[PDB]
Amino acid sequence: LRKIRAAQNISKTIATSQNRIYLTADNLVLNLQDESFTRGSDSLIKGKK
């Protein structure tokens, strides 16, 4: 069983490492957006007294 032990150790050493890949999430938001309008102006002639 010393034989088995050695085999175990070697097999495990070879075993390393494992592989896995990522599906990550990104958080944190500090993007405040401002206001905008739809421009509106008319072609007019105005006059004051």
The contact set with a second copy (CB under 8 A) reads 17-26, 28, 30
Phi, psi of 7 (to 5 degrees): -65, -40
User: Of 28 and 44, which CB lies nearer to a second copy in the complex structure?
Assistant: 28
| Cis amide leading into 41 (omega within 30) | no
Instruction: Select 1 or 25, whichever has its Cβ closest to a second copy.
Output: 25
Min CB(21)–a second copy separation in Å: 5
Structure-token match 């421009």, residue found: 39
> Which letter does DSSP use for residue 42 in this model?
-
Among residues 20 and 48, whose Cβ is nearest to a second copy? 20
